[PDB]
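Need a sequence for this fold. Nothing fancy.
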């Protein structure tokens, strides 16, 4: 069983140099699919099971369709970014959360006060 790729509102990644530590990995996929449709939540993890891999959360499922098909094997980090729609990176986002905290506030990223 294997119905081609198919969109899922999110894509998957598994071809990033194994020497980066976030801060750029996402800043590099954000300035790439943002035009493919609309990036609004790229997530990466430095876990051993979650190497450079990472998924893209698009505002619309038609955006991942491009970030995944459009480039589909583009040049990135000296490696081919074989984009593969995620099997729902939502549960996978809390899965590699690196803790899995219940959390009850996932919407706007506004701070309650500018601390030091």
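Here you go.
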């Amino acid at each position: 069983a294997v119905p081609e790729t198919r969109p899922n509102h999110t894509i998957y990644i598994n071809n990033l140099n194994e020497k980066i530590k976030k801060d750029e990995l996402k800043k590099s996929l954000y300035a790439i699919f943002s035009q493919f449709g609309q990036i609004l939540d790229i997530l990466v993890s430095r876990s051993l099971k979650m190497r450079g891999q990472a998924f893209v959360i698009f505002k619309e499922v038609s955006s991942a369709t491009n970030a995944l098909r459009s480039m589909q094997g583009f040049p990135f980090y000296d490696k081919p970014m074989r984009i593969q729609y995620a099997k729902t990176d939502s549960d996978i986002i809390a899965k590699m959360k690196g803790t899995f905290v219940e959390r009850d506030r996932k919407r706007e990223k506004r701070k309650p006060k500018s601390q030091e």
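For context: Strands lie at 10-13, 39-44, 54-58, 74-76, 79-81.
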